[PDB]
Design a protein around this ligand. Structure first.
Ligand code: CA
Ligand code: CA
Ligand code: CA
Ligand code: MG
Ligand code: MG
Ligand code: MG
Ligand code: MG
Ligand code: MG
Ligand code: MG
Ligand code: MG
Ligand code: MG
Ligand code: MG
Ligand code: MG
Ligand code: MG
Ligand code: MG
Ligand code: MG
Ligand code: NI
Ligand code: NI
Lengths: 1247, 458
């Protein structure tokens, strides 16, 4: 705001004057004046005399002027510079310039209030002077005049024909030009003529100037313009032909060009040039197609022939150029021009990849409201239908958005578009093939024509505004679904994974976390689908092993529920009610159901509440009136409360799902697709309540409209819990369709009967479920499962009469393990014909068979096994190995490689043995996989009969981060060496607490071990409160001033059978200020947990990269780091992690060396350790790429990484540590474009 | 607007009641009530007794109900209609309807100020009742909740995932459905529950009604929804395969489809269907290309072979459809489908043809500010120059505008782009061939590099 101070020194020299100005300091301001011509002055203001910045490209770098011979008179006040054309006066106190014509006429001046200053120039002039310059007008703007007398428009190049600059001049005889990258000229009719650099303009600023360099011109308009061209440069002469007429054209080839030229020449209409648009070049192709002649359009451009022939007709050719390159060829591969530009840094700063189009088409909307139009539309669809399009994805039946075209379709357009296909298909196939359609709008009545609704082009993000604000994300979707159900359209789906990202189709895919959670959510919605943007991929295996396995697992749950779900499809044909409903449908009078959308009903009997939060460690779930059973973990919750529900953020295996009291849930073996085979046994899971409930089982052909005339099958199943028995009725079959189901296996939960009757007859009892299944005719058996006592009852289905079954008495099973026959489990492999197999061709097996063909790399079998709590479970594998020697298989749990099993020869293929291994299981569903992992050194080549999983762990664990936190306690990743996904901190205020829900099989005394950190340097305290009892003091010593050290606090507690609360709290007498990580619980002494073997910090690279870790890195001095951590979701296709969300990478486009290292002290010196890691390497073969173990007492140990493009397991066994420490690391020496991924690094004690 | 006048006549007949109302003219208003089920009432208001308009496609044209055997008592004031589930009272002077449960609990009523009238319906109800229906939320909007307690959003199909309709109901035990092509539901927490036809909405209106046809539902939410499905129709059963997982994809050919299906089957990840985007069809071509299999992408779709091989692997195929036709092929010729549609009048009314794009390309801006970048840019231009491009039409050196992509080029971008060709060409030809260029922006100094300015897309 302030102007210059007093002149304290003036030094004349030729045509130059240098003024020193007082600013209060020892570094005085400098103002240099340079008389360039008789009518052109240069002024350079340099605050505090600092050196001037480089001039912008405005200024002609080669400008030269002849000597002027100006008269510079410094003898008085003002100082006076004169030429024959101008007189410049600088007043001394304070420094102010006045510019006059040589004759004395005043043109402009710096006012008393301030002239030049650090951020621009300020002049005053005649208020009626006409000002010009500054700006023009673009092809999207209101077009003003020439006058700039009241202008505040910025100086910029602009777009679409605009022009502008820091150039302001007047017909009153003067001009002002400021050297600047953009800025803000200002004029008004009080006579102000100002220019300010201001803040960074819309267009950016790449030339910043600390000085203020400007030019003052004196003269008539032509003299002003000539002076402008001396400063900024004259125009080189264009070719003379460019004075001719030119025809620019888009949509043109060589034949048409020749015809055009002939047309002009035949008529003697002069013309000198044609300009060619996209047509001239191979725009879109690899190897610099956007610089290459398109010889399909212009064959004679293969040589100089086209040029020469056109020159002979007097035609020069002009070619369109865009300042960009194609980064993807039409097979979605990176182009050579991309690699050259990327590796040399030739992209515009801040400009990322984006989507362009260059081949337009002309279209027009059809009217589906007319019967004749619909008939026509269908008739032309018949051929595609016959050749395989059996479902109609009716997109954009709502609104056109294309340029000037913004048309709306009417409210009945989706209904009528649907009617066209519906009426047409039903007529053409004689009601023989059911119609399937989807649209992205709904209005009442549309449902009559067999269409679902999908939620449109939603964003790939957790919620609206997470990454961008213009589309909703995943968390909004339940609200849209349930709003659709409230309008009578329950046949709803969404693009699981999202459609839109920042940057269009080239923008990122979902993170593995987002993808996994979205799949779990989508599996409990009516229309289950993935859908990405152009050339994006949504197959689950691309997002890493957690996403692949968690997605697979939930898909198995969905497909197991086909008979449950299908009854709701029928129900929609009778009442319109479908597969989902909001809780308010069942609880119209509950205020907490009135707007509830984070859970919903899936059919009548399941309440689902998917985990939708990023890094979510627990959920608050409202359960309405009733009694609810955890589907995966087995415990009961009374209704009418919000429960705290712990979730494992490390595994992503939890889908919170609750069974409603009275549930009757038909389910079946998992099929790859709905009609893969006949299902002759249907299981019916029954959780009886005191009031009768019922479910009508339903079958039909799945395919035609035969159901409309009675060709279907139903049987009403009903259940009631009575005073000392359970009664189940299987009603008589109804309808003319012969069903595939031959038997029901009723699984009646909550009672293990001593007798099961039917019609005055006690049913035959069998030893277990297996023996019952193998029996023909009716029977019962009993057992135990995750929910407790169970009675199994096998009965014939589709009898002509009702059966009433009654389960009485109570004789609970003594079984200690659940048995999973692996022949009933999920078999996979590298290709469809190399999957693990089922067989019966060796004797001695349990159940109906065993699993073989575990002898081609990648063959595997996967068991889904429920656990009530997290902890150690010794799982027994029954196997046969008649090979003559030991064989290996990998055991994976929740996508982590837990162990390589060495399975000894059993003597023969018909002789079986067992191997028991302690597995780290998490509460709820666990994914247990036995695999021939050739890339980890397994041999494979055994047969597997079953596994047995204990109902109770040897010791349990509870994550602090998943406990109920209150009073300021929160989760954190800001220290090292925590277990699981995080730890708990901020136990600082009185009342701060972490409360654990701990389950005990029987009343008694249990050992607790609490993992905690205390880096304060002194002892701290909390209180322990067990079941709301009397507080006991927990005294927590400090190992020193280091928050990266963790310790165990051991104690005992008296627990009751079932759920117990154990809280750790700062009560008023306690100090607090410790961090909590995990509570371990056992009836015996607590030992190291199977989940806590890893000695490295952040070995899986899962920590939020905002926070650091014990990893360090190295590269050569002067080389940029090649190392990062991310998810690999920005790539197309994705190159995800080996597990969970993130993996380390090494990459550079140019030659590089890079390493990372971590040093840990081992717990037991003079003992053996083992390093394991997942590694994947692609593109250029490096000179060196290896894992390294050193500093352990022995010489360095190396394991090389091969360039295979697939995840491999690297192992360095037999690290004999005598130094007390191990340094583990990875190193690459590459000539360029080697990409290494690293994940799942573990250092463990070797057995 | 005024409510109905006095009841001058009341004729009961089975489950129907026909009321004649005074409006001061010789053409009296008619209000017809029909008890469709024990918990569903149809009301038809016909101003001046005019014949009703045809019902919109909201209404199931085949709907029928069993006889109810409702009691209709015209003997006094109010007139009373009863079923085992509801009690409807119509006061005589003026005509106003009160809807009650059979036990006497008041649910909703037409206030003294006025109920049904020629442009809609107006009810009052408990101010604390929770209202549902009306609208959902699209993929470009802020996403609210389920409650509709203070709603003025119009009733429409909308776009981009939206849903809506003239359907408003409450967990307090009642629903209202008005037959209409768009319109304006209104609720507030004083207890208003209203619906107005209003002016022509944004989406247009092709079904106009002179009468007002509406339905009152009584019951718990599942009963309300079932009655809604009686009036507007139930859903036909979809194929059973549509309960399975489906993979929709844009950018896909037969080989990639086969590899995807193998990937799922190898891993025992269930899947029943693939949906194909533009890839499946000859969109953009003559002879109904937008209905025809693209056999460059899908060779086996020349016959039924692809269909049958995919069916043998448990995969059904879904194809994308757009409600439009291509009116000019890639070669700029009118298409057969244009001639057929134009001669038969099959285009959407008020929708004219328009230019659209569908084949994306991925691009990224270059930086002309760097000498090394300019050298590279020129070096790759030499071959085109030798073969006849002697003038450089430098387009879009100003600003990118593509969807979310809104990038500005800096003020010296035109000058520097121009400099790349100027320096290069002068060096390459040893000052022997004059440079010509044009750009659509100007900043001081750019003229040094031999460029003109054109005024853009005028
Ligand atoms: Ca077995
Ligand atoms: Ca932890
Ligand atoms: Ca990882
Ligand atoms: Mg000079
Ligand atoms: Mg004037
Ligand atoms: Mg500054
Ligand atoms: Mg043309
Ligand atoms: Mg010729
Ligand atoms: Mg070519
Ligand atoms: Mg074999
Ligand atoms: Mg781990
Ligand atoms: Mg009737
Ligand atoms: Mg009207
Ligand atoms: Mg693809
Ligand atoms: Mg194949
Ligand atoms: Mg073709
Ligand atoms: Ni402008
Ligand atoms: Ni809307």
């Amino acid at each position: 705001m302030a102007g210059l101070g007093n002149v304290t020194g003036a030094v004349a020299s030729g045509d130059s004057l240098t003024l020193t100005l007082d600013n209060g300091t020892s570094a005085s301001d400098i103002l240099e004046l340079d008389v360039l011509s008789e009518e052109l002055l240069r002024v350079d203001y340099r605050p505090s005399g600092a050196a001037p910045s480089p001039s912008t490209p405005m200024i002609d770098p080669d400008a030269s002027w002849d000597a002027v011979g100006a008269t510079i008179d410094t003898s008085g006040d003002p100082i006076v510079v004169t030429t024959p054309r101008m007189r410049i006066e600088i007043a001394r106190t304070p420094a102010r310039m006045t510019i006059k014509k040589a004759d004395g006429t005043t043109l402009l001046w710096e006012p008393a209030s301030g002239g030049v200053f650090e951020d621009g120039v300020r002049f005053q002039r005649g208020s009626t002077d006409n000002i010009y310059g500054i700006r023009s007008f673009n092809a999207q703007e209101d077009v003003g005049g020439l006058l700039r007398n009241s202008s505040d428009h910025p100086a910029h190049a602009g777009q679409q024909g605009d022009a502008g600059g820091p150039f302001m001049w007047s017909t009153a005889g003067y001009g002002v030009l400021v050297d600047s990258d953009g800025g803000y000229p200002y004029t008004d009719t009080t006579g102000k003529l100002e220019f300010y650099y201001g803040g960074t303009p819309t267009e950016g600023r790449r030339y910043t100037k600390t000085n203020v360099e400007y030019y003052i011109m004196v003269g008539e308009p032509k003299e002003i313009m000539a002076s402008y061209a001396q400063v900024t440069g004259t125009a080189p002469m264009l070719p003379k032909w460019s004075l001719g007429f030119m025809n620019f054209e888009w949509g043109i080839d060589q034949d048409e060009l020749e015809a055009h030229v002939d047309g002009y020449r035949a008529r003697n209409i002069p013309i000198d040039a044609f300009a060619l648009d996209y047509d001239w070049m191979d725009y879109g192709e690899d190897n610099y197609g956007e610089f290459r002649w398109n010889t399909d359009n212009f064959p004679d451009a293969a040589t100089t022939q086209l040029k020469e022939d056109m020159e002979a007709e007097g035609i020069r050719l002009i070619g369109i150029r865009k300042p960009r390159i194609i980064t993807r060829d039409f097979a979605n591969q990176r182009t050579q021009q991309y690699y050259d530009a990327d590796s040399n840094g030739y992209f515009y700063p801040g400009h990322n990849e984006y989507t362009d189009y260059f081949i337009p088409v002309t279209v027009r909307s059809f009217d589906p409201y007319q019967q004749a139009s619909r008939d026509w539309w269908w008739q032309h669809s018949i051929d595609a239908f016959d050749k395989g399009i059996v479902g109609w994805w009716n997109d954009e039946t709502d609104k056109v958005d294309s340029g000037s075209a913004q048309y709306w379709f009417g409210n009945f357009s989706t209904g009528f578009t649907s009617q066209a296909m519906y009426d047409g298909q039903r007529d053409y196939t004689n009601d023989g093939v059911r119609v399937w359609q989807t649209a992205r709008s709904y209005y009442p009545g549309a449902q009559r024509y067999a269409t679902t609704l999908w939620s449109g082009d939603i964003g790939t993000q957790f919620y609206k505004g997470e990454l961008f604000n213009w589309a909703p994300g995943m968390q909004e979707q339940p609200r849209i679904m349930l709003s659709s159900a409230n309008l009578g359209q329950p046949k709803w789906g969404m693009d699981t994974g999202g459609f839109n990202s920042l940057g269009g189709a080239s923008g990122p895919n979902p993170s593995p976390e987002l993808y996994t959670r979205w799949m779990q959510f989508g599996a409990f919605t009516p229309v289950f689908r993935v859908h990405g943007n152009y050339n994006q991929q949504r197959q689950p295996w691309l997002y890493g092993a957690t996403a692949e396995e968690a997605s697979k697992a939930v898909m198995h749950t969905r497909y197991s529920l086909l008979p449950y779900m299908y009854a709701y499809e029928r129900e929609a044909s009778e009442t319109g009610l479908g597969l989902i409903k909001p809780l308010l449908f069942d609880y119209p009078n509950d205020p907490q159901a009135a707007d509830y959308t984070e859970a919903w009903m899936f059919g009548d009997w399941l309440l689902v509440s998917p985990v939708l939060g990023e890094a979510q460690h627990s959920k608050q779930i409202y359960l309405p009136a009733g009694t609810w059973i955890d589907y995966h973990r087995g415990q009961t919750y009374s209704g009418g409360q919000t429960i705290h529900y712990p979730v494992n953020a490390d595994t992503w295996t939890d889908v919170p799902l609750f069974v409603k009291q009275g549930a009757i849930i038909p389910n079946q073996q998992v099929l790859d697709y709905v009609d893969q085979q006949s299902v002759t046994t249907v299981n019916v899971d029954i959780f009886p309540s005191a009031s009768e409930t019922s479910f009508t089982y339903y079958e039909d052909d799945g395919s035609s409209y035969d159901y409309e005339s009675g060709s279907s099958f139903e049987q009403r199943l009903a259940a009631q819990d009575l005073s000392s028995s359970v009664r189940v009725e299987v009603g008589a079959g109804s309808g003319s369709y012969t069903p595939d189901v031959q038997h029901y296996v009723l699984k009646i939960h909550g009672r293990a009967g001593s007798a099961v009757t039917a019609g005055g007859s006690a049913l035959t009892g069998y030893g277990d479920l297996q023996a019952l299944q193998a029996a023909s005719g009716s029977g019962w058996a009993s057992g135990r499962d995750i929910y407790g006592d169970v009675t199994y009852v096998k009965l014939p289905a589709a009898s002509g009469s009702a059966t009433v079954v009654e389960v009485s008495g109570s004789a609970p099973s003594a079984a200690t393990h659940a048995i999973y026959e692996v022949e009933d489990a999920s078999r996979s492999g590298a290709t469809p014909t190399t999957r693990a197999g089922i067989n019966t061709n060796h004797s001695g097996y349990s159940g109906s068979g065993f699993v073989d063909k575990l002898d081609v790399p990648g063959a595997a079998v996967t068991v889904y096994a429920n656990a009530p709590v997290s902890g150690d479970y010794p799982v027994e594998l029954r196997y046969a190995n008649g090979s003559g020697s030991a064989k290996t298989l990998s055991v994976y749990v929740n996508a982590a490689r837990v162990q390589q099993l060495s399975l000894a020869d059993t003597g023969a293929w018909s002789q079986w043995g067992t191997q028991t291994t302690t597995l780290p299981l998490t509460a709820g569903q666990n994914i247990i996989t036995y695999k021939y992992d050739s890339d980890a050194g397994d041999t494979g080549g055994v047969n597997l009969d079953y596994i047995r999983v204990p109902f109770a762990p040897t010791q349990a664990e509870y994550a602090a981060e998943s406990a109920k936190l209150w009073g300021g306690a929160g989760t954190s990743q800001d220290h090292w060496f925590y277990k699981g996904a995080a730890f708990v901190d901020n136990l600082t205020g009185v009342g701060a607490e972490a409360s654990f829900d701990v389950y005990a099989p029987s009343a008694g005394t249990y050992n607790l071990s609490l993992r905690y950190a205390n880096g304060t340097g002194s002892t701290k305290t909390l209180s322990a409160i067990v079941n709301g009892g009397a507080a006991s003091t927990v005294t927590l010593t400090s190992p020193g001033m280091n928050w990266n050290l963790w310790n165990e606090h051991t104690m005992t507690a008296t627990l009751t059978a079932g759920r117990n609360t154990i809280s750790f709290r700062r009560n008023s007498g306690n100090s607090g200020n410790v961090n909590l990580d995990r509570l371990a619980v056992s009836a015996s002494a607590i030992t190291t947990l199977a989940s806590e073997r890893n000695l490295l910090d952040n070995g899986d690279f899962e920590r939020d990269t905002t926070y650091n870790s014990n990893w360090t890195q190295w590269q050569p001095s002067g080389q940029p780091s090649a190392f990062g951590i991310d998810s690999g979701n920005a790539l197309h296709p994705p190159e995800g992690p080996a597990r969970r969300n993130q993996r380390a990478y090494f990459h550079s486009d140019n030659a590089y060396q890079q390493s990372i290292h971590q040093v840990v002290d081992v717990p037991v010196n003079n003992a053996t350790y083992r390093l394991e890691a997942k590694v994947r390497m692609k593109n250029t073969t490096p000179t060196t790429a290896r894992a390294e173990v050193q500093g352990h007492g022995g010489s360095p140990i190396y394991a090389n990484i091969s360039n295979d493009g697939v995840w491999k397991t690297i192992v360095i066994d037999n690290i004999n540590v005598t130094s007390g420490s191990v340094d583990v690391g990875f190193y690459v020496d590459s000539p360029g474009y080697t990409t290494l991924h690293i994940d799942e690094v573990t250092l463990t004690r070797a057995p």
